[PDB]
Amino acid sequence: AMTYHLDVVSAEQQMFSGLVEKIQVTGSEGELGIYPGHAPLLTAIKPGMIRIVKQHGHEEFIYLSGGILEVQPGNVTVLADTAIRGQDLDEARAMEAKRKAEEHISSSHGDVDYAQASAELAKAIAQLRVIELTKK
Template identity: 55%
Template sequence: MAIGVTQNTFQLNIVSAEGPLFSGKAHALAISGLDGELGIRPGHSPLLSRIKPGVAYFQTDLKGDDEILYISGGILEVQPSLVTVLADTAMHGKDIDEARANEARRAAEENINKQGNDINFAQAQMDLAKAMAQLRAVELTQKQRRR
């Protein structure tokens, strides 16, 4: 994780449209906000931000590995002792189908490279960003397992 952790914790709730993914104490959270990377620790100033597709890391145990999630987008609300992630879609890195994510990446790249008016370029870019974020979550999870 790119951010430091402390002994203190905050309540972290991560919920997607499919249901809750995590609810418990965390020492730190790193997540991709619309305007850049965000590092959240206990006592953080109140914040409301849109989340872009990316990988979220959070630490629940000072001596353990980071938890790694793929987040497709959503909303982040930060209060000094409570952080809520309302994700459109969220998945643990270990639960992502790598072959399917690679196929989604290839399809998005093809759509971006197509000529013509029937292509929604913005949607193809978003699809590519989501696929790349899923693949990054898979990669980080695999690296973590090898240690």
């Protein structure tokens, strides 16, 4: 069921959207009555699937990664933390990133165009013996 302009956003791009008269889930607070007509409030939710009456009785459970969601008065939209930022992790791989700094760590874009290219780089760049042909 459609009510209150229910959108779903994420960093790289918005997750989803719609108008959901009911959003059936349990807030990080607790059981959250699926409703239109809730007040301006702030919220967050763990990963998982929440059935929602969304536009025209279309109620669906949609898994989450963990992420934040809130409603300005009447204003509905959703944000998913792509994941919960890894505790330690980011700080553990900090050490890595640090070790990565410390013990060097490198990655690259190896495109068959970049690859086959560089093939043409030595290769094509090599085998110029006319390099001496010009003069002044």
